[PDB]
Amino acid sequence: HHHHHHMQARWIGNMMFHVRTDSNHDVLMDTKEEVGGKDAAPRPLELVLTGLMGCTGMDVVSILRKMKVIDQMKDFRIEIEYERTEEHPRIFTKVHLKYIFKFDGEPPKDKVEKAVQLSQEKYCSVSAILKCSSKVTYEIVYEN
Amino acid sequence: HHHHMQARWIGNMMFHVRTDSNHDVLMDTKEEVGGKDAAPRPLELVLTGLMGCTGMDVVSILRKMKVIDQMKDFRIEIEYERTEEHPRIFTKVHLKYIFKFDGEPPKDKVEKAVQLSQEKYCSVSAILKCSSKVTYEIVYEN
């Protein structure tokens, strides 16, 4: 009895779309004025890439909380670096994710490496979604 | 940085992005998994973005073709199935392009617009992995 999930995006004029999520939150998308938009909200691709970053970020946070070392984590960010063709169909050719951490004291690197590998290789939180003509790459960076 | 974005964890299960376009995006989860339910889920943003990708194609092309002044309403509905066990994968994805036009809908042009977005630009299928081909349909309402 597989779950059927539904969402809807409504055009609200010009190039703007509004979604009310199942989680009951607003999402707006817009584009540049040059292509008919009002630059009043993020671009659709921006939401795609942001969502992908969120999928893996949530994994890592959850896992490190679980592994009881998140209390040492002062900062965490994800950076995505991509290449994508210009001619239609525009496809991702490279996707690289940086997981960048600031810990208080020596970082729990074995735990961090495990959380990231879990997200990337077991959960496949990015690769299970995003088509890319190379394997998604990632790295782990510690900042002081 | 060209073709580069970043998401910052700001506590609990919440992340903030400042887009290249200079807008805010927030993501969060349910309280049961450590979030504050104060923003959409990451996956909701993925699928929102995908619907917007094709939605803006459709709107741009209909405007180009000079029939958008006839269009009272336009929405995209996505229906999807995804497995539950890791690795979670999309198994079925169907998009409805749902239009309300004054008078007789410009059906040839709408089909062309949707076909271009789905089949030429591959605005969804270029991006989203699914175990079955992404399907779609056009619906007219009154």
Chain A contact probe: residue of B32, B44, B129 with most A CBs at under 10 A: B44
Query: How determined?
Result: X-ray
Specify the DSSP class assigned to residue B126.
T
What domains sit in chain B, N to C, each tagged with a CATH number?
1-40 (2.20.25.10), 41-142 (3.30.300.20)
Count H helices and E strands in chain B, helices first: 2, 6
> Closest Cα to residue A78, out of A42, A49, A103?
A49
Count H helices and E strands in chain A, helices first: 2, 6
CA A41/CA A138 separation, integer angstroms: 29
DSSP string, A74-140: EEEEEEEEEEE-SSSSP-EEEEEEEEEEEESSS--HHHHHHHHHIIIIIS-TTTTTB-BSS--EEEE
Using DSSP bridges, classify how beta strands B4-11 and A137-142 pair: parallel, antiparallel or unpaired: unpaired
Helix (H, G, I), strand (E, B) or coil at A73: strand
Q: Do B4 and A130 touch (CB under 8 A)?
A: no
CA B96/CA B75 separation, integer angstroms: 8
CA A105/CA A65 separation, integer angstroms: 17
Task: Find tokens 């007789």 and name the residue.
Answer: B104
Nearest to B9 among A5, A45, A61 (CB): A61
Torsion on CA atoms A106, A109, A110, A112, rounded to nearest 10:
130
CA B59/CA A12 separation, integer angstroms: 11
Question: Is residue A5 within 8 Å of residue B82, measured between CB atoms?
Answer: yes
A88 vs B contacts (CB less than 8 Å): 120-122
